[PDB]
Amino acid sequence: DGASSVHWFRKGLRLHDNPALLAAVRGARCVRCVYILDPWFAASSSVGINRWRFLLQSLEDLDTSLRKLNSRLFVVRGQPADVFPRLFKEWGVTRLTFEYDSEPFGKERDAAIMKMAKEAGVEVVTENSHTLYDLDRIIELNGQKPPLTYKRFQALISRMELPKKPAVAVSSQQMESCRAEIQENHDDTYGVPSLEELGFPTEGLGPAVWQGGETEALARLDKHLERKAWVANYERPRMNANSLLASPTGLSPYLRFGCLSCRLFYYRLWDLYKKVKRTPPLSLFGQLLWREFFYTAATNNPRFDRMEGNPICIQIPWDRNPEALAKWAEGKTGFPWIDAIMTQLRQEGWIHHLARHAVACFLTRGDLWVSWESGVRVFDELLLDADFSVNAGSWMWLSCSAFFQQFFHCYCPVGFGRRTDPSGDYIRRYLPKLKGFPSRYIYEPWNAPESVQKAAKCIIGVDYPRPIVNHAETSRLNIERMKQIYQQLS
Numbered sequence: 001d002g003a004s005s006v007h008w009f010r011k012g013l014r015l016h017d018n019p020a021l022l023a024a025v026r027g028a029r030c031v032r033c034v035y036i037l038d039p040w041f042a043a044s045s046s047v048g049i050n051r052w053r054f055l056l057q058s059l060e061d062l063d064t065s066l067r068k069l070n071s072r073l074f075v076v077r078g079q080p081a082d083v084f085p086r087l088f089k090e091w092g093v094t095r096l097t098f099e100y101d102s103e104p105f106g107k108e109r110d111a112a113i114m115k116m117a118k119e120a121g122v123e124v125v126t127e128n129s130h131t132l133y134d135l136d137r138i139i140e141l142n143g144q145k146p147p148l149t150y151k152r153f154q155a156l157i158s159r160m161e162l163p164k165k166p167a168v169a170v171s172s173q174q175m176e177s178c179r180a181e182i183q184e185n186h187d188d189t190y191g192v193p194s195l196e197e198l199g200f201p202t203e204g205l206g207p208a209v210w211q212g213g214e215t216e217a218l219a220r221l222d223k224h225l226e227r228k229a230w231v232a233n234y235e236r237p238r239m240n241a242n243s244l245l246a247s248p249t250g251l252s253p254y255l256r257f258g259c260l261s262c263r264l265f266y267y268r269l270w271d272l273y274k275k276v277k278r279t280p281p282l283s284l285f286g287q288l289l290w291r292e293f294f295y296t297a298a299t300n301n302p303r304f305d306r307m308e309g310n311p312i313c314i315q316i317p318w319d320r321n322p323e324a325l326a327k328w329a330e331g332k333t334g335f336p337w338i339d340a341i342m343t344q345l346r347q348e349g350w351i352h353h354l355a356r357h358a359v360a361c362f363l364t365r366g367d368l369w370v371s372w373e374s375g376v377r378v379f380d381e382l383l384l385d386a387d388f389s390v391n392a393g394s395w396m397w398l399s400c401s402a403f404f405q406q407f408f409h410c411y412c413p414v415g416f417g418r419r420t421d422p423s424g425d426y427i428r429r430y431l432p433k434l435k436g437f438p439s440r441y442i443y444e445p446w447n448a449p450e451s452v453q454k455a456a457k458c459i460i461g462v463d464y465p466r467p468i469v470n471h472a473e474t475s476r477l478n479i480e481r482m483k484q485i486y487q488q489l490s
């Protein structure tokens with residue numbers, strides 16, 4: 001008997017490698033794809049324009065793909081626990097499918113939905129295609145606790161099956177054939193909203209730096225895996241000035257929203273390795289494996305993104321310093337390297353991993369001694385590839401709050417920028433107020449003589465702030481403080 005299925009998009013915003021959507025379609029007489037938009041989400045949230053644009057463009061891409069099959073995405077407004085009982089009744093739903101969510105809050109949401117579906121006679125299929133592995137299997141093999149060091153994680157997955165291959169494509173014919181009739185007034189209720197409807201400024205015609213959606217994700221995957229990009233990205237990567245700019249082959253926002261399947265990426269990367277080198281090392285997959293590591297650590301920890309009550313996080317007496325945090329968040333620290341990175345993050349929504357090391361170091365154990373929790377919140381607002389697991393996980397790792405086995409140094413907020421871009425043009429691009437400084441002073445403009453500041457038409461302390469701390473004194477004190485925190489544990 002043919003099901004009436006609803007496939008629920010949350011992440012996994014794609015039609016390729018979507019085993020949950022396969023389960024919705026197989027043996028269905030009727031299928032509807034829904035995204036549930038909580039109309040009061042923003043009331044509790046301060047998420048910025050770049051993440052909203054990326055989400056909306058991802059939903060518009062799904063709707064465009066569904067229109068090719070004479071169907072539509074249903075953007076249902078409400079909270080899942082409220083709308084699903086109505087949808088079940090009104091649409092006569094017999095099956096609900098969705099990609100598994102490992103994050104503690106989503107797991108609790110989904111468990112409640114599964115209870116309500118069971119009560120209503122609705123079958124539920126979930127598939128764990130957001131990650132490479134069954135995270136619960138990793139934890140099970142580790143004595144029912146997540147690994148807390150990366151080598152242990154690698155040992156565990158090294159005695160597990162390989163990640164599942166990407167699922168086969170849903171039949172275009174099957175999907176158009178089993179579609180729900182779209183009403184002409186679909187957009188009364190179920191349309192994808194425009195950015196201007198969310199109060200954001202009017203969008204231009206030019207493309208975003210990071211255009212959302214599955215179509216863009218797959219085009220980027222293709223370019224990313226061109227042989228001509230193999231040396232630059234996998235054989236001999238270099239952290240140079242050009243690396244700091246958003247790359248047209250970058251995949252991380254698409255992986256985070258599920259516009260790109262991590263299993264597809266994994267096996268296409270393996271395929272390219274085979275062609276070029278004629279069994280790859282684990283390091284080939286490091287980007288995906290570190291992501292999986294943080295997902296595994298997060299899934300059973302509802303306090304993962306907090307310090308207090310987080311069982312894996314050392315309790316550190318961070319300063320309560322809202323003025324410093326606000327300066328850090330707005331790029332007003334007076335360190336042009338830090339400020340340019342935070343400006344790029346706010347303007348575009350992606351910054352290089354080593355630039356994330358730099359600004360997170362400055363906020364937490366390197367300089368300002370503000371809790372990593374506040375850095376998590378700012379990255380959640382602004383960073384396209386941040387989610388509960390990788391954001392908090394990376395901040396705890398970087399700040400030596402969790403996963404600690406050895407100390408590693410924070411980069412210098414002057415020297416690291418100077419080395420990465422000796423030209424200073426990264427600074428000039430994101431902090432044009434500083435553009436007249438010669439490259440000798442542009443990373444440390446408080447050291448420029450008054451003659452140079454006058455000719456650069458930027459007087460430090462007036463047109464651009466003085467550095468908010470003395471880095472040499474502050475970082476040595478902070479190192480001393482952290483060392484004592486850890487050595488005292490004995």
Ligand SMILES: O=C1NCCN1C[C@H](O)Cn1c2ccc(F)cc2c2cc(F)ccc21
Nearest residue numbers: 353356357360385386387390391394395398
């Ligand atoms: O470089 C290394 N070594 C081990 C892992 N890794 C890559 C990091 O995960 C990159 N990264 C993030 C990715 C997503 C996100 F939402 C937040 C962060 C983030 C926060 C930090 F404070 C510092 C690094 C950060």
